[PDB]
Coordinates of C-alpha atoms in Angstrom, one line a residue:
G1 CA -39.1 69.1 -48.3
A2 CA -39.6 71.9 -50.9
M3 CA -36.1 73.1 -51.5
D4 CA -34.7 75.0 -54.4
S5 CA -31.1 75.1 -53.0
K6 CA -27.9 76.1 -54.8
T7 CA -26.5 73.1 -56.6
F8 CA -24.4 72.9 -59.7
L9 CA -23.2 69.8 -61.5
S10 CA -19.5 69.6 -62.1
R11 CA -17.0 67.3 -63.8
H12 CA -13.3 66.7 -63.7
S13 CA -11.0 64.3 -65.4
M14 CA -8.4 62.0 -63.8
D15 CA -6.3 64.7 -62.2
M16 CA -9.7 66.4 -61.5
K17 CA -8.7 69.8 -62.8
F18 CA -12.2 70.7 -64.2
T19 CA -13.8 69.5 -67.5
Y20 CA -17.4 70.6 -67.0
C21 CA -19.2 73.2 -65.0
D22 CA -22.9 73.8 -64.8
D23 CA -24.1 77.2 -66.0
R24 CA -25.3 78.1 -62.5
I25 CA -21.7 78.5 -61.5
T26 CA -21.6 82.0 -63.0
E27 CA -23.9 83.1 -60.1
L28 CA -22.4 80.7 -57.6
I29 CA -18.6 80.9 -57.9
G30 CA -18.5 83.9 -60.2
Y31 CA -16.5 82.2 -62.9
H32 CA -17.7 81.0 -66.3
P33 CA -18.4 77.2 -66.9
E34 CA -15.8 77.5 -69.8
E35 CA -13.5 79.4 -67.4
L36 CA -13.2 76.3 -65.1
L37 CA -13.4 73.6 -67.7
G38 CA -9.8 73.3 -68.7
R39 CA -7.9 74.5 -65.6
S40 CA -6.5 72.9 -62.5
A41 CA -9.1 72.8 -59.7
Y42 CA -6.5 72.5 -56.8
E43 CA -5.6 76.2 -57.2
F44 CA -9.0 77.7 -56.5
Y45 CA -10.2 74.4 -55.1
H46 CA -10.2 75.4 -51.5
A47 CA -7.2 77.1 -49.8
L48 CA -7.0 75.2 -46.4
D49 CA -9.7 72.8 -47.4
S50 CA -7.8 71.6 -50.4
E51 CA -6.1 69.1 -48.1
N52 CA -9.5 67.9 -47.2
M53 CA -10.2 67.5 -50.9
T54 CA -6.8 65.8 -51.3
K55 CA -8.2 63.2 -48.8
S56 CA -11.3 63.2 -51.0
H57 CA -9.3 62.6 -54.2
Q58 CA -7.2 60.1 -52.3
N59 CA -10.3 58.2 -51.3
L60 CA -12.3 58.6 -54.6
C61 CA -9.4 57.5 -56.8
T62 CA -10.1 53.8 -55.8
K63 CA -13.6 53.8 -54.2
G64 CA -15.7 54.9 -57.2
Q65 CA -17.6 57.2 -54.9
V66 CA -16.8 59.8 -52.2
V67 CA -18.6 62.2 -49.9
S68 CA -17.3 65.5 -48.3
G69 CA -18.9 68.3 -46.4
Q70 CA -18.6 72.0 -45.8
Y71 CA -15.4 73.3 -47.4
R72 CA -14.3 76.7 -48.6
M73 CA -14.5 77.1 -52.4
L74 CA -12.6 80.0 -53.9
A75 CA -14.9 82.5 -55.6
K76 CA -13.8 84.5 -58.6
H77 CA -12.4 87.4 -56.6
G78 CA -10.7 85.3 -53.9
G79 CA -13.9 84.8 -52.0
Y80 CA -14.9 81.7 -50.1
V81 CA -18.3 79.9 -50.3
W82 CA -19.0 76.9 -48.1
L83 CA -20.0 73.8 -50.0
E84 CA -20.3 70.0 -49.9
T85 CA -19.1 67.6 -52.6
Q86 CA -21.0 64.5 -53.6
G87 CA -18.3 62.8 -55.5
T88 CA -18.1 59.9 -57.9
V89 CA -15.5 58.6 -60.4
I90 CA -16.8 57.5 -63.7
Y91 CA -14.4 55.0 -65.1
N92 CA -14.0 54.1 -68.8
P93 CA -15.9 50.9 -69.5
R94 CA -13.5 49.9 -72.3
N95 CA -10.4 51.3 -70.5
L96 CA -11.3 51.1 -66.8
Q97 CA -9.2 54.3 -66.5
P98 CA -10.7 57.4 -64.7
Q99 CA -13.0 58.6 -67.5
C100 CA -14.1 61.6 -65.5
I101 CA -15.1 62.9 -62.1
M102 CA -18.7 63.6 -61.3
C103 CA -19.1 66.3 -58.6
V104 CA -22.3 67.6 -57.1
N105 CA -21.8 70.8 -55.3
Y106 CA -24.1 72.1 -52.6
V107 CA -23.8 75.9 -51.8
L108 CA -24.5 76.2 -48.1
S109 CA -23.0 79.5 -47.1
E110 CA -22.6 82.4 -49.5
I111 CA -19.6 84.5 -50.1
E112 CA -17.4 84.7 -47.1
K113 CA -14.4 87.0 -47.4
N114 CA -11.3 87.2 -45.2

């Protein structure tokens, strides 16, 4: 295949706001890893495609795994980048509660604006 690709690991917790962001995000979404880790995703988490992600969260909440394709992710300045989410819910082994959310983001299209 031979593909570099733009992919950054992400993590959320329960409500999936954002608890971890790969360093690549500075160049991808424009924010800082520490800028996302500790804020609610759903704000910047896609404008019209957040409903799509709601379906994803709705599915992932009790499937342990989820897939989702090209959506618009809000870039730092209100931009939109088209990405896909490889989703998984890591549950606590000792608690069986949603320990975290493991998201793999694939940057397909670059910054689309307006």
